Amino acid sequence: NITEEFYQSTCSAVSKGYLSALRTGWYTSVITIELSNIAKVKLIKQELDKYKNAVTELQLLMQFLGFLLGVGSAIASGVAVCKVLHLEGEVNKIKSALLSTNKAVVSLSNGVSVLTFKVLDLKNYIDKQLLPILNSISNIETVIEFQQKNNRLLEITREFSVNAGVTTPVSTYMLTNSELLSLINDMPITNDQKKLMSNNVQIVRQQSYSIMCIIKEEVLAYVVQLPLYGVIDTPCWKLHTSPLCTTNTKEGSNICLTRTDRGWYCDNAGSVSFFPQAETCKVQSNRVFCDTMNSLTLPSEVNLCNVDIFNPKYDCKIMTSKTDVSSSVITSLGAIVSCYGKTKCTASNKNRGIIKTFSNGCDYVSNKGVDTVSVGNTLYYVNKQEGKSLYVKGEPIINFYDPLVFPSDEFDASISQVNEKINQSLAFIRKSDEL
Amino acid sequence: NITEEFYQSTCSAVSKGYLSALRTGWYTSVITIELSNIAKVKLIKQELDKYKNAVTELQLLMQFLGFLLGVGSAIASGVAVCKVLHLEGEVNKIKSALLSTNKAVVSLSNGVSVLTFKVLDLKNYIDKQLLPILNSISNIETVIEFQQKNNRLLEITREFSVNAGVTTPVSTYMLTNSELLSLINDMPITNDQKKLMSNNVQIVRQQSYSIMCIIKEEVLAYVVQLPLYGVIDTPCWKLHTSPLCTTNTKEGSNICLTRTDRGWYCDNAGSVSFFPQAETCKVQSNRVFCDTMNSLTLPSEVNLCNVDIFNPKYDCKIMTSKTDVSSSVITSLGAIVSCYGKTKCTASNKNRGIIKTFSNGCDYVSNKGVDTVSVGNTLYYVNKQEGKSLYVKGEPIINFYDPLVFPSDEFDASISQVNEKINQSLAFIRKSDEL
Amino acid sequence: NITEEFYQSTCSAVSKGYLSALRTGWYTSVITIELSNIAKVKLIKQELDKYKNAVTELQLLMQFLGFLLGVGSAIASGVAVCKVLHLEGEVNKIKSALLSTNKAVVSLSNGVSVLTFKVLDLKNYIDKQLLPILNSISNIETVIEFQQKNNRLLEITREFSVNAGVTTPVSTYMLTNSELLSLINDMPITNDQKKLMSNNVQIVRQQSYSIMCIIKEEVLAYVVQLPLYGVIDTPCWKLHTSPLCTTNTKEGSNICLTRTDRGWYCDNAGSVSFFPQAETCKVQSNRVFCDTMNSLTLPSEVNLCNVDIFNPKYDCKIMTSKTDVSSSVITSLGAIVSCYGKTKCTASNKNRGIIKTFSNGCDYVSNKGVDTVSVGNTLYYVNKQEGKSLYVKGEPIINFYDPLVFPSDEFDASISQVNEKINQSLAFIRKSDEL
Ligand SMILES: O=c1n(Cc2nc3ccccc3n2CCCCO)c2cnccc2n1C1CC1
């Protein structure tokens, strides 16, 4: 299962063992609620005005390397469908197909065959239960049943109200679990995809959008926009990097280097999907949920940067500085510690206290027997996930650089770019020498 | 209406056709709820203890270029009013003016004439409905009416609880739609401003704050802080930029350049308001809602950077790198595609599939007939907004630069700054030549 | 109390007078709800199916200098406990200890002695109130009491549903105020710590996590993860910095410099905790709530950068540019104004209007008599906190630099790094001179 290697030479760690679940596409579907246009009945008269107020609100609704990412439009697929429902006869084409069945496909005269779904029939209820008796007296409940149907409308309306028509995650009121699962059952997708979504509906919900579309002809329509997971069960690995600095006694005489390529990496279609912001990803035990909108597509060679950062096949990205501050990175199965200067850095067991005091430099410790890590005044709990760690001994590459000609304000840089800068300044040095 | 030009020479696009709605100021108003200090009645006894618990909770409450932005204090206007209500007699000055009318102006003895507003009178209700009968028996409902008044208190209290006294957006419980609209009617603002806010109350709500102020003398007061839109119906345009790189076969021999000045631009008072984070802005069809807190004020000359980026009147901002990664930017009426290296970049129609395969470089495609764009493993839906696009053919300016003396780690840079760097290094070259 | 000095020489301001409250550790505790496994009764039959649906949802849940910060794992302490509850007999060890008392310590056979707490006993209720009568008829309410117990379950379930098992802030449904306060009473902490948390429960709530742990053996368990405030009542001060530029008439001939070390500073354990993102901190009157996860530990010498930025004991961090844009920073007791170019910058009184027009450069004004500040098209309200300001006159240090050899794209830089860059280029100049 989960494993982790630490590289002393580059102050970085890789956690492998994970399986992908990447949102690669969207599945849109039109969700409809049909509406009515209007002593134990005083309850019903109350709920009935809660009703009109919701309808009223609804009508008011009308009238390091992350900077390298592109810029999408997350709900462009859903709004594309909404804009079509505004065509005339298009709300009736839906209203007609959803007469004798609660789920139908409406060819929207735009290209898409959209799955339409009537989740709530208030129009029918109010007109075939409340309307005949509103012409004084109430039976049994009924009162209960209406309060339940209606409350859902109020919840949906409250969400669209506070979010100005677009919500996420998709609540159980936008789409109940039984509705969602039947939607999943009728998706043109592999059985693996269906079981993945069913075992993780709340994650699925979190990657979905609900877009308020239209109120017209006693019908409320919103578009639910669900994730397509086109990439599933491919290898994933997370890269943790921390500043690697020299440790000369004299303050400010030090140089530093950080691999800037931290994030999630997943094998994808012959390339590797890279996610520079490792919080656009959510881990569940050993399954990594990601969104390809927040990714770059890179050559698979990129993994060579961990094995060997000076390699000729991929140019590994680094940043440089003279800023030797202490800090820690909490990995999947341990902790990276960049201890510099006068800082007090330790690792501790819950019951025994400090078991390791860190030297200046960059070091690593596994969660096996260690509960917390301390850098300066910052206490970090480590992840207590079960796995195996490997410490890969090696000379910190920062020691291979002469501080005199080291370039120290590079951010969008790399190993070859830095060497190029060094060569250039050694050229100048050997040319003034001959003077 | 909406239109868009793409500039091949600078890998950028401008969407024009939009109308401004900029929050330029705040409108504060004190909102008050008067409180009471204490078999079908067992319901009322229940709601009455829900009441005391809310009061209890309430009392506990007491005792690219974005880095160039300034730093405001969003609720400083509202807290300014709150701090005054803590003066003595100031809660009574309010409580006295709101005796026979539900809406009054209280001169707060600080300068401001604040609009005071009593939205809920629980004190009166409990003491003139529940208190006389609590001395055993219940009439009719009444039970219903109290549950409704009280539920609002509980909703307001829940919001102030989970947000530690400051909430946004302002919910329909903080301020109902009928209350908000009457507030809007009595605002010292132009009719255009009133219709704008009325046609978009949920957006208005989203730009408002609710600040819990005080509980004192059987009175709950919070300050609602509503947006003033001082700039309305002025031209707006959004700028989309993407990395422009050379495309030499040999990996890593390439240079790149990105216009760093993407964002919203709105004509404002003889200058142009620039919003570097184009998600501090929300578009509704063709109206752009923005906040001037998140803006810079620039010369109107800034638009010349699109027509002609080498112009003498404004120095256009760019960043440089050697990092030729592929990506896409989804514009208002199409997509910009920066395809580099081995990446597979295409555009597709829903029903027909791939209709264009992109060459290495920077290119553009309109939403007219194109539904999705693909860069590497990333599928992007384009916006299906109705508009007209224009492709402005031109030589990519990156081809005008000799890679040998190109400065490649500039972020906070510009066209003239880069030329200055180039001149300097050509000076050195022509001085070593004469050796 | 609160005071503020402005430094004209470096365009910066320091607000002192604050007292710390730093989350330094976590306090975890297992919270349990015991569950049942199954005409006025039609209400109860309703609430009973709301019940089963919640249980159903719950079971589905199973199966400038911020870039210098380290990377923690916020809920690693809580999940550590959760993973233990999944051991066998571990849910029964809890269920057994919580038989005759509602609060017990369960030695989890892992090391920790965790505080276990049964907040809601639905199993007992349903089986000792509803189950004997479900074998037709209902007494009194009871109906009310069940609706209240059950509603809490539904609220807890709704939160865990929409947040996929991890929530924050911890709601009054996860943990009521009376439960929280008893938890606080039994914490191994100083009386100062207890009074601090009791006077600020909503802030405490905002720094807490609730982590859904397990459903097993008619028991629901979640881990509430509360903040430990190990540092309390130590001096804090916030640093405000703004761009300091030259003001030569000719556009683009100017140089700029910004102290990049803005944020919160708190005295902590012989060092100083620095918080580069001053919105990971929340002020309540004069108490600063912070999280040490978002901090660096620095030498106490760092405060010398305000007194004297050219000092030999700490190297003060600055960034440089040629980008002279106007902006403002709203401080605790006034405003910093960086006015450059053609921008219109003013300060105004509510009742009197413009009382100061700013010259080009960097200037400051206190909240005493000033209500708003205007830079370009941006209106800023100042904070109306009561305090004393001091303007420290001084030559802006930017005027000490020759523009010809000034390094203008440094971000991760400092005063000594810049001088070093200058010396190097003056070396080259004096060596070409002798030619
Ligand atoms: O995003 C960046 N940049 C880009 C960058 N370069 C610059 C040069 C001069 C002036 C400003 C510059 N900025 C803007 C940084 C604004 C952060 O709030 C960085 C440069 N050096 C070190 C870390 C950097 N990061 C971190 C990932 C957050």
Short mmCIF file of N, CA and C and ligand atoms in Angstrom, two decimals, chain A residues 64 319 411, chain B residues 67 411-412, chain C residues 64 67 319-320 409-412, ligand 1:
data_model
loop_
_atom_site.label_atom_id
_atom_site.label_comp_id
_atom_site.label_asym_id
_atom_site.label_seq_id
_atom_site.Cartn_x
_atom_site.Cartn_y
_atom_site.Cartn_z
N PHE A 64 3.79 25.77 -5.27
CA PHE A 64 4.53 26.94 -5.72
C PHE A 64 4.16 27.32 -7.15
N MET A 319 13.70 26.84 -6.89
CA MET A 319 13.85 28.27 -6.61
C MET A 319 15.04 28.44 -5.69
N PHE A 411 12.89 32.26 -8.98
CA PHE A 411 11.68 31.59 -8.55
C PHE A 411 11.22 30.62 -9.63
N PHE B 67 -0.80 41.43 -5.90
CA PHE B 67 0.09 41.82 -4.80
C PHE B 67 0.30 43.33 -4.78
N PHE B 411 9.22 39.14 -13.18
CA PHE B 411 7.81 39.00 -12.86
C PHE B 411 7.14 40.37 -12.83
N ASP B 412 7.66 41.23 -11.96
CA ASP B 412 7.18 42.59 -11.85
C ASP B 412 7.89 43.47 -12.88
N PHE C 64 3.19 39.11 2.41
CA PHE C 64 4.06 38.85 1.27
C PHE C 64 4.82 37.54 1.45
N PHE C 67 4.82 32.35 1.50
CA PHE C 67 5.39 31.22 0.79
C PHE C 67 6.53 30.58 1.60
N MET C 319 11.31 44.18 -0.83
CA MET C 319 11.24 43.88 -2.26
C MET C 319 11.42 45.18 -3.02
N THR C 320 11.89 45.09 -4.25
CA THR C 320 12.12 46.29 -5.05
C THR C 320 11.33 46.22 -6.36
N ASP C 409 14.02 43.92 -9.48
CA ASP C 409 13.09 42.81 -9.58
C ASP C 409 13.41 41.81 -8.49
N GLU C 410 13.63 42.34 -7.29
CA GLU C 410 13.92 41.50 -6.15
C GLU C 410 12.66 41.36 -5.30
N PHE C 411 12.33 40.13 -4.95
CA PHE C 411 11.17 39.87 -4.12
C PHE C 411 11.59 39.28 -2.79
N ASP C 412 12.28 38.14 -2.87
CA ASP C 412 12.81 37.48 -1.69
C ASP C 412 14.17 38.08 -1.34
O1 LIG D 1 4.35 34.10 -6.51
C1 LIG D 1 5.50 34.18 -6.11
N1 LIG D 1 6.53 34.96 -6.72
C2 LIG D 1 6.36 35.77 -7.90
C3 LIG D 1 6.95 37.18 -7.76
N2 LIG D 1 8.19 37.54 -8.20
C4 LIG D 1 8.39 38.89 -7.93
C5 LIG D 1 9.49 39.77 -8.17
C6 LIG D 1 9.42 41.12 -7.78
C7 LIG D 1 8.25 41.59 -7.16
C8 LIG D 1 7.16 40.73 -6.93
C9 LIG D 1 7.24 39.35 -7.32
N3 LIG D 1 6.36 38.28 -7.22
C10 LIG D 1 5.03 38.35 -6.64
C11 LIG D 1 4.87 37.57 -5.32
C12 LIG D 1 3.59 37.96 -4.56
C13 LIG D 1 3.30 37.02 -3.38
O2 LIG D 1 2.27 37.60 -2.59
C14 LIG D 1 7.74 34.77 -5.95
C15 LIG D 1 9.06 35.29 -6.08
N4 LIG D 1 10.02 34.96 -5.21
C16 LIG D 1 9.79 34.14 -4.19
C17 LIG D 1 8.53 33.58 -3.98
C18 LIG D 1 7.44 33.90 -4.88
N5 LIG D 1 6.05 33.53 -4.98
C19 LIG D 1 5.34 32.65 -4.08
C20 LIG D 1 4.48 31.45 -4.47
C21 LIG D 1 3.90 32.57 -3.62
#
